Design a binder for these strands. Structure first.
Length: 548
DNA sequence: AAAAAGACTTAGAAAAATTTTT
DNA sequence: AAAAATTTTTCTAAGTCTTTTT
């Protein structure tokens, strides 16, 4: 059981009518280091204050990671650690390199190993304590039901792990108290703050979806506590997301033949945005918001391209005209491509590239803000991200219908599905030998069992009784079980091998549901509980003849 | 119109949990 | 009977997009 797609449209603007919960689970108080776990600075044994010893542990735990080998990290870490230090220590500890965490490191490594092998009997209780935490704070009451909360556990204090070349990595993540926690609820039983505390602010805003919010010290940005992907306040928007990408599917031809004329505009921004959009569409390039310089890791999207991320080569690789992309994309993923394009864009690109130093914005007089405004102008609620959802649902849908072999069995049909998924990861780009010794092992185990039926075949030929035919048939199914078993490992092998370098985000699930249904493939084999619990609506309201 | 704050979605990377190899 | 290997779950950083306001 669960709503809700069989439900009556909540209007825009209203998120909920009733909202009540039990607040966020804070990080358990810091347990001070045991006596025989010491920290020496310069070989000199030291016992740090609890606030300083806390931070020390953070580094002690990552004393086996690449992060702690990098300057930016170590530079930011110490400075912040210096702040959590009493005048006593402050004066003494002047540099990080002189500190010795190796003992504290070994300790938590022991702790981890110790918790790796505890009495199974007790393990159940940590799964129990966990479960009770789930039962008590993991759920909430929105409107008329008990929807699950996603990240009900507050963010523990640690060391900010900046992906890529982040000038902030290593900085101290403060322990968030209730005095920082903002609460959202409706007529609801306000959750009491931990004995002796007070919330930052208890507000009732039904124009947003979050339950708890606080500002993080590292970037100031606000962190939210939201509901499970299975919830309606999330599903409603997910079902709507793909529908918007389906709305686009219609007028895509109009929009395509539209921005193709916008290349001839008597205005820069228009002539510019048209080229930008051409990329977002053709290469599933992300919008590309303007980042803070020196406050974040420097990456770029489509709008935020600089002239140094591209190069134009009239003739290259023999065709024609080529645009060489080279830049770091999202989670510092380096995007590098030479893309043969139309002449109009080539000529248009060079125009945006006269009298400018590499450090200048390629698409100036242009930003995501404008580009998206122009988008919700043509089609309702249309944005840049939508284009990727369309491009690679459509592509998946087409891939299976041309990969899936109608007459094959389940495991072989399952691989057809996975194979399509790999092909989908081509436009967006990407996201043994112990096996063969069990494959080849059972490969003979099959022929040496097909041999039983071989000799049992000659039995019935001249002994045409009946109980003999029962033995012949009992080896037939025995060979089939090995025929089955084999194909499962033969599939796994080529599958695992195929994979070298969207499933959770850009793919309309309904596409899969319709495929799974028409080819009689149980959804359990394609989706785990995480997946079908969230894709509940699509698993339900999708006939075998659904097309994007 | 423009920018900064605020809200919401995407996703990589780790941690737990599960099956499977030694 | 750990250990090694996959495959789910949790986590939270990194984007997009919207709302709010200078």
């Amino acid at each position: 059981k669960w709503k809700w797609w069989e439900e009556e449209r909540y209007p825009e603007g209203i998120k909920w009518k009733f909202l009540e919960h039990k607040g966020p689970v804070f990080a358990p108080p810091y347990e001070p280091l045991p006596e025989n776990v010491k920290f020496y600075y310069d070989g000199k044994v030291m016992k740090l204050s609890p606030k300083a010893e806390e931070v020390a542990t953070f580094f002690a735990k990552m004393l086996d990671h690449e992060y702690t080998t990098k300057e930016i990290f170590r530079k930011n870490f110490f400075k912040d650690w210096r702040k959590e230090m009493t005048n006593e220590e402050k004066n003494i500890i002047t540099n990080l390199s002189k500190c010795d965490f190796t003992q504290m490191s070994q300790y938590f490594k022991a702790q981890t190993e110790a918790r790796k092998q505890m009495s199974k009997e007790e393990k159940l209780k940590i799964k129990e304590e966990n479960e009770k935490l789930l039962k008590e704070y993991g759920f909430c009451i929105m409107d008329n039901h008990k929807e699950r909360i996603a990240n009900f556990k507050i963010e523990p204090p640690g060391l900010f792990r900046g992906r890529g070349n982040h000038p902030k990595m290593g900085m101290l993540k403060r322990r968030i108290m209730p005095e920082d926690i903002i609460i959202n609820c409706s007529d609801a039983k306000v959750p009491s703050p931990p004995p002796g505390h007070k919330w930052k602010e208890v507000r009732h805003d039904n124009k947003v979806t979050w339950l708890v919010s606080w500002t993080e010290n590292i970037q100031g940005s606000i962190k939210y506590i939201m509901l499970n992907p299975s919830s309606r306040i999330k599903g409603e928007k997910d079902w709507q997301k793909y529908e918007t990408a389906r709305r686009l599917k219609k007028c895509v031809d109009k929009i395509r033949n539209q921005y193709r004329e916008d290349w001839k505009s008597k205005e820069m921004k228009v002539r510019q945005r048209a080229v930008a959009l051409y990329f977002i569409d053709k290469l599933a390039l992300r919008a590309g918001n303007e980042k803070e310089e020196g406050e974040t890791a420097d990456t770029v999207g489509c709008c935020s391209l600089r002239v140094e991320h591209i190069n134009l080569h009239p003739e290259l690789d023999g065709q024609e005209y080529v645009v060489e992309f080279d830049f770091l994309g999202r989670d510092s993923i380096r995007y590098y491509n030479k893309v043969p394009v139309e002449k109009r864009v080539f000529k248009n690109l060079q125009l945006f590239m006269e009298n400018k130093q590499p450090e200048d914005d390629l698409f100036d007089r242009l930003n995501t803000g404008i580009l998206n405004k122009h988008l919700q102008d043509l089609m309702e609620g249309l944005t840049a991200k939508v284009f990727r959802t369309y491009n690679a649902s459509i592509t998946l849908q087409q891939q299976l219908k041309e990969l899936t072999a109608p007459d094959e069995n389940i495991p072989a049909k399952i691989l057809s599905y996975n194979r399509a998924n790999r092909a989908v990861a081509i436009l967006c780009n990407h996201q043994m030998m112990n096996l063969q010794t069990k494959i080849d092992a059972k490969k003979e185990q099959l022929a040496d069992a097909r041999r039983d039926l071989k000799s049992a075949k000659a039995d019935a030929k001249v002994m045409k009784d009946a109980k003999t035919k029962k033995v012949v048939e009992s080896k037939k199914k025995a060979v089939q079980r090995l025929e089955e078993q084999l194909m499962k490992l033969e599939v796994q092998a080529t599958d695992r091998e195929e994979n070298k370098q969207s499933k959770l985000n850009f793919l309309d699930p309904r596409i899969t549901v319709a495929w799974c249904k028409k080819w009689g493939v149980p959804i359990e084999k394609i989706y785990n509980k995480t997946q079908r619990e969230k894709f509940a609506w699509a698993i339900d309201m999708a006939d075998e003849d659904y097309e994007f």
